[PDB]
């Protein structure tokens, strides 16, 4: 809708609540609002008042030591968009040290344009982790929310579910909650930044956040770009001018604000490019009749004066004060203590300056990576100097790698010396390149630039070592390179070789295990020169590695340290045959099949093509064919470095002193299977209850002939059948003429393995169980069984067969009456 309320420039509230009563008819705030230091308050003093008309904060909102407020939604239930023209240590919402605050309640926010949110040190705060800040803010990695009750403890966040949308923040769909009875509004992604209505329809293109009617420029709650009489517009039409990047004013408003500073004590407003601007930039001037920035002839810059010479740049709210400057009166002390990348906002704020009268000092900055945000820095004058006569000071910059890019950039340092200490990713070649570009070569004294602190973590050796002769094997690499000599050859201590395995190609520079190399012996001729190399040994087959060679040297401060290094190249082992396929286990379900299970071996060696599984039926043992198991013995198997640096320099010092003192001037086809892409194989079509020979090989190459591994041997046996050992067929008798019974039966032709014994349980009626053992040779001798010398009567003969697996089934009792020779 429209804006019911007055313009309301930003005031400051302190120590009693009487000046909070001036926010009745306020729709927007042009400025910052700081509700701070509220000591003699109660929770009964805050719930009886509300200001629901307020919609927009331009600069920031600050809360600092306010007692008794348990949620801020009693104050501001309709705060929509925080803009962020001026900031507060690059934040627009600082909530610091709230005692007796438990929840936020700020449900009507979904966009803050420029800045971040830092909430800390609230000792009773909950509902912090249940807000998805990714749809609230743009740079969401510059948030800093820590040290509250919601991360120290595990207070219960009661969420309204039975309705809130469940979004993701790391891996889980948890509901987005503000209070116990207010959901967080999440628009669909077709409404990108324009917002959605209550039914989820996208609003107008100049709407922002909330609209009562979708695709309506008159019904936006907050304008996105500019405001003119209830109509959100992308730009101001003439004669309306832009004002503070949020609204359209006319000529009389900027003229009256010019007259309220010209006839008073301030920001005397001008106009340029149809925008009511505080000051004219460089090349422009101020008239008397009209307020326009007409072009000033000649060199006519913007000159900004610093307060007492020094300005300490610490954040964006100090960087934005020097916006549009070209000539700096004094010295800049850039000290950004950070952890977040602030180079883009410092690029957008600074970089329009040309000349610095004092000195540029960088000190203790962690989060900078370059000093190229000064896009237009030409002349450092050094009229006011750092004590020690330095026009440039660089101490303890942790991640500073490059000063500038010297393909295009250039700097003219007039007076003063140079200073460099504790810059571990910065190199002396870059320091000497800035010394050659700036022309300050013979100006500083010795030990103004540090020699051992700089570049100790960055590999900037600035020489290339070409790998000359590389040959591979199964698990050994012959590495070679061209020989390099520093011009005192005894300062070369050897080669500082580094090795690592490489699953990828984007291996980082500078784990990372090490071997050390003896230096070569030169023969002072260029004929052979003894290309040094290293025989690399003890590797893994079919593994890409990461090989680079750095030169280990001896420091001398009259020159540089020294430097030569090689690029991180990769080498491939290719191999021939893999290792033993392990885990031999033999599972045999049923009687005609055996499944096989195994693990892959330790060498993949390229593609696992197939597993070469061999099987062949092993015959039974010869010694169990003839052994009498009716005899006794019937058991059958049921089947430091610096000391070495000092030693090398001690040898060089002794050769130095000795030369100074002395020289003075005056088949068989087994059944096998190509088992592709499975760790299991059923081997069916078998003989039941016999041994098998199982040979397993891991073949890494199939098509340009079969290369297979060394074999693994295991044996197996199936389960016995049910009726293989059961005696089938009737048992017939041959009763002889002298009471001799000769027994004929049909033996099992294909039993479980073999049957070693035939037990006979024969029972006369009126008698007990009598036993007689029939072995295999007893069966072959008597073609069955023979009974000799027995009592007359009817018998009941049951015969079981005892196999290698065990007993079979008993036969039926054959009733026969032998001759009594009495009756």
């Amino acid at each position: 809708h429209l804006y019911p309320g007055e313009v309301c420039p930003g005031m400051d509230i302190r120590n009693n609540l009487t000046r909070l009563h001036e926010l009745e008819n306020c729709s927007v705030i042009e400025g910052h609002l700081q509700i701070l230091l509220m000591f003699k308050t109660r929770p009964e003093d805050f719930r009886d008042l509300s200001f629901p008309k307020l919609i927009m904060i331009t600069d920031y909102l600050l809360l600092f030591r306010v007692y008794g407020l348990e949620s801020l939604k009693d104050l501001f239930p309709n705060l929509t968009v925080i803009r962020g023209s001026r900031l507060f240590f690059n934040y627009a919402l600082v909530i610091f040290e709230m005692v007796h605050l438990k929840e936020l309640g700020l449900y009507n926010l979904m966009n803050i344009t420029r800045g971040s949110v830092r909430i800390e040190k609230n000792n009773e705060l909950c509902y912090l982790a249940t807000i998805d800040w990714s749809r609230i803010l743009d740079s969401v990695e510059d948030n800093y929310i820590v040290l509250n009750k919601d991360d120290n403890e595990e207070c219960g966040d009661i969420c309204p579910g039975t309705n809130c949308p469940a979004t993701v923040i790391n891996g889980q769909f948890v509901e987005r909650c503000w209070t116990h009875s207010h959901c967080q509004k999440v628009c669909p992604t077709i409404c990108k930044s324009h917002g959605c209505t209550a039914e989820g329809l996208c609003c107008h293109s100049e709407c922002l956040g909330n609209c009562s009617q979708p695709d309506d420029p008159t019904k936006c709650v907050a304008c996105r770009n500019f405001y003119l009489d209830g109509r959100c517009v992308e730009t101001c039409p003439p004669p309306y001018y832009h004002f503070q990047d949020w609204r359209c004013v006319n000529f009389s408003f900027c003229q009256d604000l010019h007259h309220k500073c010209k006839n008073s004590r301030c920001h005397q407003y001008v106009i340029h490019n149809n925008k009511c601007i505080p000051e004219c930039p460089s090349g422009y001037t101020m008239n008397s009749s009209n307020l326009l920035c007409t072009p000033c002839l000649g060199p006519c810059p913007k000159v900004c004066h610093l307060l007492e010479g020094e300005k300490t740049i610490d954040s964006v709210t100090s960087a934005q004060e020097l916006r549009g400057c070209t000539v700096i009166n004094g010295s800049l002390i850039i000290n950004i203590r950070g952890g977040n990348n602030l180079a883009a906002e410092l690029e957008a704020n600074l970089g329009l300056i040309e000349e610095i009268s004092g000195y540029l000092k960088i000190r203790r900055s962690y989060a900078l990576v370059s000093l190229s945000f000064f896009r237009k820095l030409r002349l450092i004058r050094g009229e006011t100097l750092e004590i020690g006569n330095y026009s440039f000071y660089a101490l303890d910059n942790q991640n500073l790698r490059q000063l500038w890019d010297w393909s295009k950039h250039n700097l003219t340092i007039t007076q003063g010396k140079l200073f460099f200490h504790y810059n571990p990713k910065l190199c002396l070649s870059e320091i000497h390149k800035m010394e050659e570009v700036s022309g300050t070569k013979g100006r500083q004294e010795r030990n103004d630039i540090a020699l051992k602190t700089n570049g100790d973590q960055a590999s900037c050796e600035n020489e290339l070592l070409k790998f000359s002769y590389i040959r591979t094997s199964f698990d050994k690499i012959l590495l070679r390179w061209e020989p390099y000599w520093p011009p005192d050859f005894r300062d070369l201590l050897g080669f500082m070789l580094f090795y690592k395995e490489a699953p990828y190609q984007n291996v980082t520079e500078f784990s990372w295990t090490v071997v050390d190399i003896d230096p070569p012996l030169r023969s002072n001729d260029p004929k052979s020169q003894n290309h040094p190399g290293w025989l690399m040994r003890g590797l893994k087959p079919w593994t890409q590695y990461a090989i680079f060679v750095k030169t280990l040297v001896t420091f001398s401060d009259e020159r540089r340290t020294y430097g030569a290094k090689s690029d991180i190249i990769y080498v491939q082992t290719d191999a021939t045959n893999p290792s033993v396929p392990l885990d031999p286990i033999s599972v045999s379900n049923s009687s005609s099949q055996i499944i096989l299970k195994w693990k892959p071996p330790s060498d993949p060696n390229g593609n696992i093509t197939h597993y070469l599984v061999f099987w062949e039926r092993q015959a039974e043992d010869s010694e169990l064919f003839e052994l009498d198991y009716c005899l006794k013995g019937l058991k059958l198997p049921s089947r430091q470095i610096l000391k070495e640096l000092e030693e090398s320099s001690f040898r060089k010092t002794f050769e130095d002193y000795l030369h100074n003192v002395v020289f003075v001037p005056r088949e068989e086809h087994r059944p096998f299977e190509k088992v592709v892409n499975k760790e299991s194989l059923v081997i069916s079509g078998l003989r039941h209850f016999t041994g098998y020979r199982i040979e397993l090989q891991a073949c890494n190459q199939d098509t340009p002939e079969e290369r297979c591994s060394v074999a693994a041997y295991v044996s197996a046996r199936t389960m016995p059948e049910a009726k293989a050992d059961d005696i089938v067929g009737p048992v017939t008798h041959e009763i002889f003429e002298n009471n001799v019974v000769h027994l004929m039966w049909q033996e099992p032709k294909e039993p479980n393995g073999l049957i070693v014994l035939y037990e006979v349980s024969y029972r006369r009626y009126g008698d007990e169980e009598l036993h007689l053992c029939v072995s295999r040779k007893h069966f072959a001798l008597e073609r069955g069984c023979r009974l000799r010398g027995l009592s007359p009567g009817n018998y009941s003969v049951r015969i079981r067969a005892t196999s290698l697996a065990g007993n079979g089934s008993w036969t039926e009792p054959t009733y026969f009456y032998v001759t009594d020779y009495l009756d």
Binding site: D518, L521, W534, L535
Partner: peptide, 24 residues
């Protein structure tokens, strides 16, 4: 006399092509 001195005592590389130039 190289096979007990280029196992687990660990050795350098120059004696390997020195022994190769002594054998051939």
């Amino acid at each position: 006399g190289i096979v007990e001195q280029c196992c687990t005592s660990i050795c350098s590389l120059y004696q390997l092509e020195n022994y190769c130039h002594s054998l051939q």
